[PDB]
Amino acid sequence: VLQVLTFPDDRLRTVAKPVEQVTPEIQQIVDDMLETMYAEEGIGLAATQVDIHQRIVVIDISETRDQPMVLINPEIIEKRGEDGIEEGCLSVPGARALVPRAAEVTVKALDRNGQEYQFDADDLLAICVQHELDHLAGKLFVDYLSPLKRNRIKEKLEKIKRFNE
Ligand SMILES: [Zn+2]
Numbered sequence: 525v526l527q528v529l530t531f532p533d534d535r536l537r538t539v540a541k542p543v544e545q546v547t548p549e550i551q552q553i554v555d556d557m558l559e560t561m562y563a564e565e566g567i568g569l570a571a572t573q574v575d576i577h578q579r580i581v582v583i584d585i586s587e588t589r590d591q592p593m594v595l596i597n598p599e600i601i602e603k604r605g606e607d608g609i610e611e612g613c614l615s616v617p618g619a620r621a622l623v624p625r626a627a628e629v630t631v632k633a634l635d636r637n638g639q640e641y642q643f644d645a646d647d648l649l650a651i652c653v654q655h656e657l658d659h660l661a662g663k664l665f666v667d668y669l670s671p672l673k674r675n676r677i678k679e680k681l682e683k684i685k686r687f688n689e
Contacts, residue, residue: 526574531616537662540579543596546638557582566614568652570659581656585648596634604628611665619677623668625654
């Protein structure tokens with residue numbers, strides 16, 4: 525029954541806790557998060573973004589939208605090089621900006637079945653991994669921008685929700 529939190533919500537700054545065991549409940553969070561992500565046409569989503577404060581990320585960067593990746597307790601064990609591309613975020617609707625990142629990452633994680641696995645990534649996946657793990661640390665891509673640009677984005681989003689609740 526998930527919707528995405530939007531900047532400047534303080535719940536987006538919560539540091540996620542490790543998942544302890546991959547239970548059917550965790551599997552259900554995973555499934556729901558993938559449905560949300562596809563419906564919002566995203567290529568990644570962190571649990572923190574739907575107010576679930578546990579280290580779960582889902583990603584699909586494929587143009588055919590059928591190559592899902594599930595990352596439970598992901599950890600970047602090595603970063604190499606520098607790169608960056610234009611990023612957006614379902615939690616920052618309407619904003620896009622170049623973010624400096626590592627070019628390559630080595631990532632360890634559990635899959636949807638609790639199997640630990642390790643992989644290297646570059647290009648869009650490396651970027652999306654970094655972006656999504658930032659969320660689990662309470663960081664948003666607008667944190668890499670200038671204050672004036674970030675403040676404008678914040679003010680525009682606050683306006684949108686000013687009559688809520
Ligand atoms: Zn994001």
